[PDB]
């Protein structure tokens, strides 16, 4: 999996694209406070899955945020898994 950019110890959270790294909660809410610019920062969510990316989509069912390929390969092993309906971040 994913170590976290700021502070190697913990395990990635979220993804600043601004920043362009991949980080842990408490690095994510240290690095973006200090200042008026970093706050304005938008930030979405690692995959709860591979944990080695961004997600694309959101699943209430699957109560899991997920990359493209991850959440295509989640809900491609079952025509049940298929009908499950996923939304975009
Ligand atoms: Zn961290
Ligand atoms: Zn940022
Ligand atoms: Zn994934
Ligand atoms: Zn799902």
Do not use: G, W
Request: hydrophobic share 35%; charged share 25%; aromatic share 4%.
């Amino acid at each position: 999996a994913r170590p976290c950019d700021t502070c190697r110890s913990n395990a990635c959270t979220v993804y600043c694209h601004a920043d362009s790294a991949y980080l842990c909660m408490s690095c994510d809410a240290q690095v973006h406070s200090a200042n008026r610019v970093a706050s304005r920062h938008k930030r979405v969510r690692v995959c709860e899955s591979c944990e080695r990316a961004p997600a694309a989509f959101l699943c209430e069912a699957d109560d899991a945020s997920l990359c493209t390929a991850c959440d295509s390969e989640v809900h491609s092993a079952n025509p049940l898994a298929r009908r499950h309906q996923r939304v975009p971040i």
